[PDB]
Design a protein around this ligand. Structure first.
Ligand code: NAD
Ligand code: NAD
Ligand code: NAD
Ligand code: NAD
Ligand code: 68O
Ligand code: 68O
Ligand code: 68O
Ligand code: 68O
Lengths: 257, 257, 257, 257
């Protein structure tokens, strides 16, 4: 495949519905070697089995809230991999009151801090910690949502963070770019995942996108996965600092009328 | 003038070079009543001199890092003003290492937290605390920079925060729009202010903009001030969720070639 | 007012619902001297009556399809006005089939050509023709629609033209900028005007914007007029190459959910 | 490869430097069957030599200025291929004066017409003529330049056309999307090609992008080609109405400082 011999580290794999699972599925198909992260202990078993499904024994704990676990992630990884060809940042979090109802009702300094700490900052943080072992033509990838560009109901505080996230894509790309490293994001359309359940009217978003997107259909983790594998590969060696929409074209229209 | 009888609260006035001072001059010229904030105690005297310069006795302390000072700002203001017609958010801060040199060099979890806390969160925080006394056609205004939209050298962590800020503009507009309140931003060009001294090689950006911007000239706080007065006034009652470029058109070109 | 002594030529005044009529009124209110254009002979009486309402006798024919009338427009104006301080391009046209139903169904080489000829080329065409008598800090203004940025139902071929138009703003601004001239556009929200009747299901868009826009209301030509007057004035001297949304914030959200 | 059994029609292949050659080059590698177009007779021999290099005998004349040749193109193709899985629009033209020096100096109603006729209209025009034989999951691709988004020196009238083109991408995606067809564009960075020679100071742009783009390097037709092959394949079935930047990240920075 077009990722032969590339070693890629995936975060955010939580279930077989997770976006990170779809990307994983595609990277494996195209010849990648995979390593995974998890947060919390009880999940050690499930992720090790996910890793086993993809022919990997390489699983590491990493709660991006802790500086210690981040540094420790790549110290451990260096003992297995001399270098890293790809990193996928598929992580997001917000206190549910901060992603439900009115934007201001759930706005607190503490909810703001956490959403940005976990959903935005953690990406260049992981980039910084991996830099000592990144290959010369490595590729970093994160996941964003249209909610950064425009105000979407219920997304609220999470839209602020993703705007910061998409900005870090551009700044990371400049910083790591001279070395030949690429940094991009996929702005995925709505997909039913564990995190999605935290969004109050998620079901309303799904039907609307299915109805109004140019392709008249929602996206799948297979579609996001192929797009991700592409950006992680040398096929996209001319592409960096990009926010690519894989949302059946929804971002480019005004639907509902 | 076109702000007659409008009561506007101004933050971020620190010197006669500050952007908030330019807006203040224009608002007063157009007939507004002004109130000002300061941070720290030692600054209590200077802002009063500036406040008197605009025919005002209304000064209140507000370090937007402290939840308490924010709430007290509008409780104290409420004893003087029945309602609030305009709010100007002219606040910015980042640890200087986070706005100097390489993006990752100055990237630390704590630098990220602070820049976003002060430069982004503080805007909707002030909006939420002010909400009880905002008029039907009140107008909130914040200041941004092109560094949120594209990667500009040295702007670094502040670019991430400014991206969140511009996103908060949109979500604020949706939340407060139903009540009739408008929320906008000016993406201002480079102005040599106290804050400007914190961005290393600020001088090259000024030279570059003066040379390559369509109008072949940098902008002034007089110009940004007039632009602010427009947005705070009933002249712009059809304008909300907007990021207005006041940078002699620089954002719209690829200069240097 | 803030247009004292400014001489402004307004095109596209056809009725008291026209956007150009709202702009004229705001410009007159703020102290400008006005001149108007019309297309065809029959309309000569109609515009002359409109010009009198604004204390003007300066009316000139100009069908922008004809190169001759454009050059002749500013030859005639020159005999009355030594210089021109503002020019408003409120012109648009396309065969109705090209702005009805499906995009491809109404696509013909000729429909494409005309839409772009009248709605796009005529703006920089008039700019070029006016330059010999434009003042040092003159201001050019055109009207666009969100249909340039994103695909809107039934707008179709007109969306292509508006994208060219918004591009012409940027290239014009660089071209005319060294002289000190500013060039901007207003992206107006839906307004019930004569041109509006050519957009099938215009009413559906009106209802949708009123329901989903942040301010929960459609805009008026008075709001667009004040915004236009601002951009034409020296209050906006730091503003060029800008496409400013005056649409109650509709552009910044994903409505319907 | 990942384009096995897909039949793709390529336009705009003129030399071994052409962008269309890089795409052809990638599509064949990935298992596609190719057919090509040429314009003028004199080039008939040359393109057949190219088509043979990619194992094809299918070559057809098509000057996209003539409605007749467009219709005839897909009539002839229909005799060899029952269906079409891919269409590549790699076509552009403008009078040399309209892409040289000042924007207004080279502006004529006629130069404008030609640039928009060939570089913009010709794309959805070909899409429409192909529609009767497009596969259900076929994929259309065009080439654009950053000059549509921002004002670039010397690009001038061509930037307007490319802006209309990028809009036609969005409206096409909606029109053809219900059928399952995808429409995208690649906004390519500078490539030294035959068309490139029409832009004064092409080299000045090359030097600047290599110096300021995040990857500190210009792009190649191989890189644009792989990106093109991706979008034409079912790997990007979740991607439509997209303008993908393949320019080493240049669009995302403010360079020169
Ligand atoms: N599913 C969608 O509709 C959708 C759409 C657009 C973007 N996204 C983005 O995709 C990414 C993945 O979300 P998903 O929908 O695939 O869901 P998911 O809920 O299965 O995954 C979210 C992941 O975040 C991880 N995470 C949360 N807090 C963490 C922390 N402190 N440290 C480490 N990991 C932490 C969890 O372990 C989990 O695997 C997120 O960034 C989300 O914003 C999702
Ligand atoms: N100067 C420029 O070129 C420029 C360009 C674009 C945007 N901006 C933005 O304009 C705004 C004002 O900057 P300026 O250039 O006028 O500068 P200035 O340095 O004179 O003012 C900055 C203000 O921030 C305030 N501030 C900092 N930390 C604070 C805190 N914790 N709590 C409360 N207030 C705090 C200071 O009191 C000061 O009044 C900022 O938001 C800045 O991002 C500036
Ligand atoms: N009404 C809206 O909802 C709306 C929204 C966004 C933008 N606009 C823009 O507003 C402008 C028109 O304002 P309006 O829509 O209120 O309409 P209007 O119908 O009153 O004006 C359209 C004008 O175009 C002029 N015109 C048409 N063909 C012409 C030609 N060949 N030569 C010269 N003039 C010609 C007509 O004389 C008329 O005055 C257009 O540029 C249109 O794109 C309108
Ligand atoms: N070269 C670059 O740096 C660059 C960058 C961005 C976008 N582009 C776009 O890429 C496309 C191809 O350009 P290129 O640089 O690969 O160059 P190229 O000059 O080799 O190809 C241009 C093609 O246009 C075709 N063409 C022109 N007029 C035509 C007509 N009337 N009918 C049919 N075909 C016609 C020619 O056959 C030729 O193959 C163009 O659309 C151009 O806008 C080029
Ligand atoms: C609306 C589509 C969408 C976007 C997400 O970022 C998303 O992921 C999160 C949402 C809120 C908080 C944390 C997330 F990871 C889930 C989702 F369904
Ligand atoms: C355009 C250059 C520029 C941008 C700013 O946002 C700016 O304002 C700040 C930047 C960093 C930290 C605090 C600021 F107020 C100052 C300045 F000179
Ligand atoms: C949908 C909102 C809208 C936008 C226009 O550009 C508009 O103006 C025109 C539309 C089609 C043809 C000519 C026009 F001036 C009218 C209108 F109602
Ligand atoms: C500056 C990058 C660039 C863009 C083009 O569209 C391009 O192709 C053309 C340029 C002008 C006129 C017709 C073209 F096809 C060549 C080129 F070098």
């Amino acid at each position: 495949g077009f990722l032969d011999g590339k070693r890629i580290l995936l975060t955010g794999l939580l279930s077989n519905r997770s976006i990170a699972y779809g990307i994983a599925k595609a990277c494996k198909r195209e010849g990648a070697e995979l390593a995974f992260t998890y947060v919390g202990d009880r999940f050690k078993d499930r992720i090790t089995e996910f890793a086993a499904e993809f022919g990997s024994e390489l699983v590491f704990p990493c709660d991006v809230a802790d500086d210690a676990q981040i540094d420790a992630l790549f110290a451990s990884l260096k003992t297995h991999w001399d270098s890293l060809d790809g990193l996928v940042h598929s992580i997001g979090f917000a206190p549910r009151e901060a992603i439900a109802g009115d934007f201001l009702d759930g706005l607190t300094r503490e909810n703001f801090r956490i959403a940005h700490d976990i959903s935005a900052y953690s990406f260049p943080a992981l980039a910084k910690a991996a830099l000592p072992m990144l290959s010369d033509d490595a590729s970093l990838l994160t996941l964003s949502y249209l909610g950064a560009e425009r105000a979407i109901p219920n997304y609220n505080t999470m839209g602020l963070a993703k705007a910061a996230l998409e900005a870090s894509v551009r700044y990371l790309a400049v910083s790591l770019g001279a070395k030949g490293v690429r940094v991009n994001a996929i702005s995925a359309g709505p997909i039913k995942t564990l995190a999605a359940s935290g969004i109050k009217s998620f079901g309303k978003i799904l039907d609307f996108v299915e109805s109004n997107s140019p392709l008249k259909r929602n996206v799948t983790i297979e579609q996001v996965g192929n797009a991700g594998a592409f950006l992680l590969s040398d096929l996209a060696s001319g592409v960096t600092a990009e926010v690519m929409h894989v949302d059946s074209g929804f971002n480019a229209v005004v639907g509902g009328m």
